[PDB]
């Protein structure tokens, strides 16, 4: 299990924005397969794309949605594994890796961290082989295309970096994306949220990425039973019977634990705004502000 393979099901409509690399791929990797006759001759498609850009994007995720899209089968590995966990095999890994890409047309290799190749003699082997590999558009033959993800694309092999035509930045997302991912990291989690309440969610996380997004939405969705536990003191409100969560001394307010009482009659507050935006507070943005100049610089100088 060093190489992952799925067929993956992640549509277009499932990656939260990103609409201008979505463009781009679609260009680069869905009109060479939906219309295969547009590349005869010495007109040919893509076969390397980089994917750089801040951590916490999900850039492996949009490679599952042109994988999906493509209707190609996404083999996957990662550079970090290969140059630390397995290390002696990892010639044998790139080998195999690349073969059954062949044997499985159409289909996608992701490798994610490909910076994490070159340096800190053993790991120049990787690099050395990924190279041979890159040079199987001249197999003959394909058929598979070679997806590169990277965070820190300045410290990704020049050699490599060269080795993929076309680049493409996925950068953090934008209002209406981080919308989105509101959206669908809570789903179906009951709450009383509005489309207004998302977009004020959405407005309020300037600067987050996808995965600090999911950190603060699985923070707030326990809020309410946060709630439940810690008091002391609940409340009758309104089907026979209902108590929810209130602060010491109250309208009706009786002292008590969770513990004692009865099975459903509990009212569970309702998960709101503040929920989230008290889970916005307490989980700063991942991602250096700096990095939109070091990563506009590579796109200044090799985009």
Known sequence: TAILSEKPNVKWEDVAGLEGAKEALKEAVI???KFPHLFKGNRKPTSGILLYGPPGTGKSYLAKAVATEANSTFFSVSSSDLVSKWMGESEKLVKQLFAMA?????????????????????????????LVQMNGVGNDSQGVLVLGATNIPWQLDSAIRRRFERRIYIPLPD??????????????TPCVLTKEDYRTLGAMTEGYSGSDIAVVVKDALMQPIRKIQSATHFKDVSETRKLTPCSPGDDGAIEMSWTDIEADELKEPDLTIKDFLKAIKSTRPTVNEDDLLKQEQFTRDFG
């Open 31 to 33: 009109l060479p397969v």
């Open 102 to 130: 062949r044997e499985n047309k159409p289909s996608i290799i992701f490798i994610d961290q490909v910076d994490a190749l070159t340096g800190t003699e053993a790991s120049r082997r990787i690099k050395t082989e990924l």
């Open 175 to 188: 209002l209406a994306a981080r919308t989105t991912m509101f959206e669908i990291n809570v789903g179906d």
